[PDB]
Design a protein around this ligand. Sequence first.
Ligand code: RET
Length: 133
Amino acid sequence: TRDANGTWEMESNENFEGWMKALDIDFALRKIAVRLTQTLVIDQDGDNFKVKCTSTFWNYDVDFTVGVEFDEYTKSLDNRHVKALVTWEGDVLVCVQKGEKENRGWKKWIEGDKLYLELTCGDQVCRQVFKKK
Ligand SMILES: *C/C=C(C)/C=C/C=C(C)/C=C/C1=C(C)CCCC1(C)C
């Protein structure tokens, strides 16, 4: 479907550490991030999204409009400037983040009550699955 609204609880996360290493997140921090439970809340109104991924001390938020490139500064992650763009490819929500890292971005597949999220950087893919609470 295209309706990603909801509160999404993590069911699985594969290759998180490889993806974080490809972004250059500090090794010591990685070993903390791997322990943290993540909650993903998405508010979607037309083209307008507000995405909030939260854990006890570490969050990632992004707000965007589909089809509108935006300057993103990943201040809580690797602290880089990218030019980000989120588009629909059929029912897949696709983000490409142009900048230093190649093949950087993410894709969301919504399948009923499930959300599949693939985060890419370089040659690494992290595959996550969430279920709608
Ligand atoms: C559509 C959903 C998206 C783009 C979710 C993105 C979430 C992240 C990039 C979360 C990253 C985090 C870490 C790399 C370390 C631990 C803290 C998190 C979960 C906020």
